[PDB]
């Protein structure tokens, strides 16, 4: 028999974490591991049919992905879709495959709207989600005695696909249904220097625990302006939602990072503005089986796609696609062993949800609602040398914080500042 | 040859203005007229192929509309799409047909984002659009002398597909572009009383000229509370953006209306509560051919779809579909005259845009951007019997705000109130 996998991913543009340049090699490693294992689809063949999800302009689009998916379905009749990664591309395709009753695997599409499993009834997300960053923040608040109020800022940059809007959307909508805190949001524009001044004039009267989604340079500028204005960190703490650790040169591996240094000249005053700043980031798997996967992933990305991978946490999306496809194949074996069909769709997914699986990225846990439990890590500065490193990891399945090698969060006062001053603003 | 016309409208739900139950006989009167005109598309026939834009639940959907459009496009090769009306259903089809280069006619889909025309290329809107309401409001402001502040409120109701959000968005964006005026916006839930109380408590601090988009019976419980809180008509003006005249039994005739009358025991206070309120509706055509067309349309709607057309102002959407299809036929006729073809989407379209027409709704004019120029109307209270009637018709082609003969705006103080209180906020 033949099992057809439909890929709707950016084939030519190699700037997306889910681009076929990076995901492509990983799906090749996975599909050769099912062929080398007798206990996975014994005697069945797995073939991939490629469809693009991007314009003639090379950007993932909401009008090319649905049409590519429709063409793929009509011409190949896929068993499953490897799914777009972009939010606006994945939404229509998610609804379409929900109507067709075919699963949809994807390590992208992290927006909050995909958790409504009455519309995306068959969408399994094997990668990180923005909604599961809000139960990390809730646990962080509980550990540090924050129960009253917080503030959240996201930045507008025309190029991106509203990344911070969706990220803060998930964080905000999840951290106030399981906490009794008062959270308020606010939006500014990146590199509109007149907006930072207004933002600083507003912030003091809006909160003391602040979460910013922006680019690293925007965050560094805000930190410098806050230091100028006297928001010195004995009463403030700024969290930078840098999921992929792009301010930390990829955030993967043990190495001093010092993300406040750019040779700008004012990197001495940009050092004491970061001693009241934490950074939230995806967790780098530490498995010996994960580092061996990246090596051959990079090799085969160079051999077959002429693309050179740079280390970083952005490589956990290829690995999440690997794990998700392996999980799907193992759940499709059990559906056949029980007298089912490869085209159930509905019975296959329920053997993937509320299930825990061992992949290169570690021991997965696909929660009962489809999404996969995500792990994040917290970075803070070392007063000795002033370099950031991971200080506190969060295990998304057990939902409990873990310190690292006897590392304590560096608070200027020794203990976290309250989220409401003594004289309430 | 034959000219196929693909229809994507609700084929079974008769509760939408753009429902095939209503629009169905409207396009049948149009296609029965080209057959009677040797000078319109002489040596061709016209066919209609129907696709539904409805869930299994029975409502507009953004997954069934594009899928029906795709099936129609591939099974039949159309020359034009009569297009959905619901904004969330029309957007995907608009993008699809723009990609295929097939024109899209639609008297619905009034949202502001349909006018980009770098995305929705080849989309002629022959019916009302919410952006054109900002032009009417700007003319009102320039006439009545208030050019420094306004407040807009849109109510949220789970059922409707965010009608008031889109209406107020269009008005807000267009006013902001037309007037150097600072405006505020706010959203209140439709079905709870705490929201109304907080709204009235925080209204005196944000504006004196208020535009309200809400249900006909939720603007009357707001007007009662405002009267009870001392927000008399000396200081405030409350504009009810009731485009389809629900609060006025339709507003299709010259009879007195009394929107404040319910006979529930507090019908006396409501009459002096509505002395501070004006109502903004669409303009009902005043030409005899519109009345004859309605007379034929309601007979045909009953005699072919088993639907009893209500006598209201919501019937200008069927008439808009009729006029738009006749205009498209004229444009394609011209195109064929000059050695063209039915499939020249761009050339057929560019002859529709930026030119006037004579339908049953009057003398049309489609803006150079592709959107018909909309005419609005403004109702007011008679000081004698407290009956509502029109005082100001607005012509969108020449943007002239012309008052009815024998009628004038009646203000409690004899002249419009200021938009900024003399003392201050």
């Amino acid at each position: 028999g033949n099992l057809t996998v439909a890929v709707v991913l950016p084939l030519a543009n190699t700037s997306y974490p889910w681009s076929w340049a990076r995901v492509g090699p990983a799906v090749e490693l996975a599909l050769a591991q099912v062929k080398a294992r007798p206990d996975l689809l014994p005697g069945w063949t797995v073939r991939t049919v490629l469809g693009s999800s991007e314009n003639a302009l090379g950007v993932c689009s909401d009008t090319a992905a649905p049409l590519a998916a429709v063409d793929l379905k009509w011409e190949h009749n896929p068993a499953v879709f490897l799914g777009p990664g972009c939010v606006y591309a994945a939404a229509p395709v998610g609804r379409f495959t929900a109507h067709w009753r075919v699963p949809l695997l994807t390590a992208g599409a992290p927006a909050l709207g995909f958790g409504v499993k009455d519309e995306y009834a068959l969408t399994t997300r094997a990668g990180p989600s923005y909604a599961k960053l809000g139960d990390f923040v809730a646990a962080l608040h509980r550990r540090l005695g924050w129960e009253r109020q917080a503030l959240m800022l996201y930045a507008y940059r025309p190029g991106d696909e509203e990344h911070c809007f969706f990220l803060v959307e998930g964080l905000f909508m999840r951290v106030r249904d399981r906490l009794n805190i008062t959270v308020d949001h606010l939006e500014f524009a990146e590199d509109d220097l007149s907006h930072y001044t207004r933002l600083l004039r507003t912030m003091p009267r809006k909160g003391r625990v602040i979460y910013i989604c922006s680019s690293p340079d925007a965050f560094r500028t805000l930190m410098l302006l806050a230091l100028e204005a006297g928001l010195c960190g004995e009463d403030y703490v700024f969290f930078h939602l840098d999921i992929f650790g792009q301010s930390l040169q990829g955030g993967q591996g043990p190495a001093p990072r010092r993300p406040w240094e750019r040779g700008d000249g004012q990197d001495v005053s940009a050092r004491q503005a970061f001693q009241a700043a934490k950074i939230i980031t995806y967790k780098d798997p530490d498995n010996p089986e994960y580092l061996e996967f990246l090596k051959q992933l990079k090799h085969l990305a160079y051999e077959q796609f002429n693309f050179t991978m740079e280390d970083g946490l952005v490589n956990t999306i290829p690995a999440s696609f690997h794990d998700g496809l392996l999980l799907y194949i193992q759940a499709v074996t059990e559906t056949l062993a029980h007298g089912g069909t490869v085209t159930d769709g509905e019975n296959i997914t329920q053997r993937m949800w509320n299930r825990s699986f061992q992949g290169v990225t570690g021991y997965l846990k696909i929660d009962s609602s489809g999404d996969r439990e995500t792990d994040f890590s917290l970075w803070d500065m070392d007063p000795e040398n002033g370099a950031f490193r991971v200080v506190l990891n969060y295990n998304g399945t057990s939902q409990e914080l873990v310190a690292v090698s006897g590392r304590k969060l560096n608070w200027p006062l020794g203990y976290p500042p309250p989220d409401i001053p003594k004289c309430g603003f | 040859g034959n000219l196929t016309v693909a229809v994507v409208l609700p084929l079974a739900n008769t509760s939408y203005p753009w429902s095939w139950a209503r629009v169905g006989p409207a396009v049948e009167l149009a296609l029965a007229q080209v057959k009677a005109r040797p000078d319109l598309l002489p040596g061709w026939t016209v066919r209609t192929v129907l696709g539904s834009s409805e869930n299994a639940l029975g409502v507009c959907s953004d997954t069934a509309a594009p899928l029906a459009a795709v099936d129609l496009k591939w099974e039949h090769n159309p020359a034009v799409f009569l297009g959905p009306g619901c904004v969330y259903a029309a957007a995907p089809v608009g993008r699809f047909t723009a990609h295929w280069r097939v024109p899209l006619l639609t008297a619905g889909a009034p949202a502001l984002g349909f006018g980009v025309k770098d995305e929705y290329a080849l989309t002629t809107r022959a019916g009302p659009s919410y952006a054109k309401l900002g032009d009417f409001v700007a003319a009102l402001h320039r006439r009545l002398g208030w050019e420094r502040q306004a407040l807009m409120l849109y109510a949220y109701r789970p059922g409707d597909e965010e009608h008031c959000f889109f209406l107020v968005e269009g008005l807000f964006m267009r006013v902001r572009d037309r007037l150097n005026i600072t405006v505020d916006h706010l959203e209140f839930a439709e079905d709870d009383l705490s929201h109304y109380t907080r709204l009235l408590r925080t209204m005196p601090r944000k504006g004196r000229v208020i535009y309200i988009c809400s249900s006909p019976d939720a603007f009357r419980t707001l007007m009662l509370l405002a009267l009870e809180a001392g927000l008399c008509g000396e200081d405030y003006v409350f504009f009810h953006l009731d485009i389809f005249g629900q609060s006025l039994q339709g507003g299709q005739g010259p009879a007195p209306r009394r929107p404040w009358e319910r006979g529930d025991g507090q019908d006396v206070s409501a009459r002096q509560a509505f002395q501070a309120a004006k109502i903004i509706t669409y303009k009902d055509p005043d030409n005899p051919e519109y009345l004859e067309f309605l007379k034929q349309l309601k007979h045909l709607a009953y005699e072919q779809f088993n639907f009893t057309m209500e006598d209201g102002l919501v019937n200008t959407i069927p008439a808009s579909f009729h006029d738009g299809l006749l205009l498209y036929i004229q444009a394609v006729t011209e195109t064929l005259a000059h050695g063209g073809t039915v499939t020249d989407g761009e050339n057929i379209t560019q002859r529709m845009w930026n030119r006037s027409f004579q339908g049953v709704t009057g003398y049309l004019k489609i803006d150079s951007s592709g959107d018909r120029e909309t005419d609005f109307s403004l109702w007011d209270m008679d000081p004698e019997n407290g009956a509502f009637r029109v005082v100001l018709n607005y012509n969108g082609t020449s943007q002239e705000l012309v008052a009815v003969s024998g009628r004038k705006l009646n203000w409690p103080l004899g002249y419009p109130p200021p938009d900024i209180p003399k003392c201050g906020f």
């Binding site: 709207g113 909508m173 949001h185 939006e187 | 957007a91 949202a111 984002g113 968005e169 807000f172």
Partner: peptide, 24 residues
């Protein structure tokens, strides 16, 4: 959902930051 978050993931409703707190 709130006045800003929890809508549909269509690009047609993202034209204006209406209902959201913004500086632009």
């Amino acid at each position: 959902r709130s006045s800003c978050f929890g809508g549909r993931m269509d690009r047609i409703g993202a034209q204006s930051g209406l209902g959201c707190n913004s500086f632009r």
